[PDB]
Structure 1
Amino acid sequence: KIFKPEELRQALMPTLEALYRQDPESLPFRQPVDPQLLGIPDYFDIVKNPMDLSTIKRKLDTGQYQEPWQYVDDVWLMFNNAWLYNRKTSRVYKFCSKLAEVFEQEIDPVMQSL
């Protein structure tokens, strides 16, 4: 099945804005992780493939996907990175898990749609 670029944005962006809407849980994820700014200099020794909401939003704003699981792939990569780097007890890890709950709720019916 082919997917028109304007169609994905209009049908996938609601799932993305549902993540941005989570405050404060989306705050760690709205911009790429800057290890020097954040005081976590070891981040890239653990996270080899970074991803964040702003990169996803900019991709989606230029239709730079091809089918929904591509977008899913980036969102899950952002989640997996955060669960790998941050400790289970940590605020950012818990924020990530909240976002992941919201995202599964929103993405399951949009995935059934196409």
Structure 2
Amino acid sequence: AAFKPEELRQALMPTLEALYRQDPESLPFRQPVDPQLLGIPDYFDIVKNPMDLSTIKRKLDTGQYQEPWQYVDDVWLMFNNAWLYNRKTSRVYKFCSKLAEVFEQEIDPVMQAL
């Protein structure tokens, strides 16, 4: 199957918006991590492939996904980066876990539809 850019946007953008709607849980994920602003200079030494909601949105808007699984992979990269970097007791880690639950719920019916 070949997927057209607007087909992917129409199907997948609502799943990304579902994450944005989580407040406060999406707040640490709405923009790229800025280690200087956040006072965490070790961030890029630990996280080699940063990813965040705004980058995923831009990739959908600019047709950079050819297959739905590539979008899923970027969302999961964002989650895995946060679980790797942040401590289990931290706000960002627990917020990540909530987003992962929401994403799992929203993405499945969409994948069944395509």
Give the TM-score normalised by the residue count of structure 2: 0.97
> What is the Cα-based RMSD across aligned positions, in Å?
0.5
Structure 1: 4+ residue segments shifted above 3 A: none
Instruction: Measure the CA separation in 1 of the matches of 2:6 and 2:52.
Output: 21
Structure 1: runs of 5+ lacking an equivalent? none
TM-score, normalised via structure 1 length: 0.97
Q: Check if 1:24 corresponds to 2:57.
A: no
Q: Which residue of 2 aligns with 1:64?
A: 64
Paired residues, number: 112
Residue 69 of structure 1 aligns to a residue whose secondary structure is helix
Task: State the shift of 1:113 in Å.
Answer: 1.2
Note the C-alpha offset of 1:52.
0.3
Residues in 1 aligned to 2:6 and 2:95: alpha-carbon distance in whole angstroms: 30
Separation in 2 of the partners of 1:64 and 1:6? 11
Identity of aligned residues (%): 99
- Rounded Cα–Cα distance in structure 1 between residues aligned with 2:71 and 2:33: 19
SS in 1 for 2:107: helix
Deviation of 1:108 after TM superposition, in Å, equals 0.8
SS at match of 1:10: helix
Q: Alpha-carbon deviation of 1:112? A: 1.2
Q: Deviations over 1:13-51 (max 9, x none)?
A: 000000000001000000000100001110011100000
Superposition deviation, residue 88 in structure 1: 0.5
- Please give the secondary structure, in 1, of the residue aligned with 2:62: coil
Residue 83 of structure 1 deviates from its aligned partner by 0.3
Deviations 1:42-101 (A, max 9, x none): 001110000000000011111210010000000000000000000011110000000000
SS of residue in 2 equivalent to 1:71:
helix
CA distance in 2, matches of 1:53, 1:11: 16
